[PDB]
């Protein structure tokens, strides 16, 4: 039952994450880690869970593992970055820790970006358990073995998955940049909320309804944009 | 007099000619739209891909786009030549 948080309507700096470099693994798909700030995105999601170091490879696009195919499966088109880093000290207790669990058995493969909240013991074929849980019938939960004495190789890793989708709606998940005053009637490079295009900017006659944030022509190319701070509507054309 | 009336009353006279006009317009439009298609790439817009990808990765995706985009262009040029040749024959006939 992985924890998911939706982060939006705010400004995040990824330099500290990239900059800090206190994490064992910082794999990035479809996004340059260094280039993260410049790009702007909407509907960012956060994934929380802890799995052993050996299975860290399994939590990636187009990979196979018991947990990946039975607990949490990343989509093929994922454009997110996943960060891993050990917290051995936190996972070592004198009493021992076993509140962390992973599923062993399930009848069918878990869907991508979905969590199975159902609590049941997996049943295989005949001699149905109905809570009997003897031989060939297995309870859904399975605990972990994180111990201080236990080796680093199988020691706990803390894994966070960062997933984002871009160019759908106006984006508030924008990065670090200090904005600049708008320039009109002069061919200049421009970026609006993580959207980049270059053309002449002029006051636009076209009237936009409150919900809309973009305009397009017959060829589905950007034709108009609204400066978020200003509230105005303008027409973009190639300079020359 | 009749011919004047016939011409004003219908688009059928220019259908043989117009088909050529429409067919050329449609071919150009498809190719232009092609730009939108991903062609196996992460994202269709060229700048977007470059902005969010580091050079080596960006290299691969760029290559993919070019191959997809090269093919699109090839079809247009190849398509255009056949039509050009067809139009050329008419002009000779046209010129004749």
């Amino acid at each position: 039952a992985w924890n998911r948080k939706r982060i939006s309507n705010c400004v995040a700096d990824y330099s500290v994450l990239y900059n800090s470099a206190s994490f064992s693994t910082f794999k990035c798909y479809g996004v340059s880690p260094t280039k993260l700030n410049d790009l702007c995105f909407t509907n960012v999601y956060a994934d929380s869970f802890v799995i052993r170091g050996d299975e860290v490879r399994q939590i990636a696009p187009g990979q196979t593992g018991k947990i990946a195919d039975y607990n949490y499966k990343l989509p093929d088109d994922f454009t997110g970055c996943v960060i891993a880093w050990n917290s051995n000290n936190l996972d070592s207790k004198v009493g021992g820790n076993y509140n962390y669990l992973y599923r062993l058995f399930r009848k069918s493969n878990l869907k991508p970006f979905e969590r199975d909240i159902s609590t049941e013991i997996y049943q295989a074929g005949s001699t149905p358990c109905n809570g009997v849980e003897g031989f060939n019938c297995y309870f859904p939960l399975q605990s972990y073995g994180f111990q201080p004495t236990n080796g680093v190789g199988y020691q706990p890793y803390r894994v966070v998955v960062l997933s984002f989708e871009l160019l759908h709606a106006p984006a508030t998940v924008c990065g670090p940049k200090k904005s600049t005053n708008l320039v009109k009637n002069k061919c200049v490079n421009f970026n609006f909320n993580g959207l980049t295009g270059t053309g002449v900017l002029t006051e636009s006659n076209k009237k936009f309804l409150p919900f809309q944030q973009f305009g397009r022509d017959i060829a589905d190319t950007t034709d108009a944009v609204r400066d978020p701070q200003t509230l105005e509507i303008l027409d973009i054309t190639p300079c020359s | 007099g009749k011919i004047q009336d016939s011409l004003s009353s219908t688009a059928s006279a220019l259908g043989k000619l117009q088909d050529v006009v429409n067919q050329n317009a449609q071919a150009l439009n498809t190719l232009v739209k092609q730009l939108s298609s991903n062609f196996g790439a992460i994202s269709s817009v060229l700048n977007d891909i470059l902005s969010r990808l580091d050079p080596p990765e960006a290299e691969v995706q760029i290559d993919r786009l070019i191959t997809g985009r090269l093919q699109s262009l090839q079809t247009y040029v190849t398509q255009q030549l056949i039509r050009a040749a067809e139009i050329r024959a008419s002009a000779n006939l046209a010129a004749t």
Partner: peptide
Amino acid sequence: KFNGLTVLPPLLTDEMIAQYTSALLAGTIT
């Protein structure tokens, strides 16, 4: 200039083409 595709102007204008056509027609009758 629409999106990197440019439609060059015709070498002969529509008006110029009409004169050639008019000339041939004029020549035929006279």
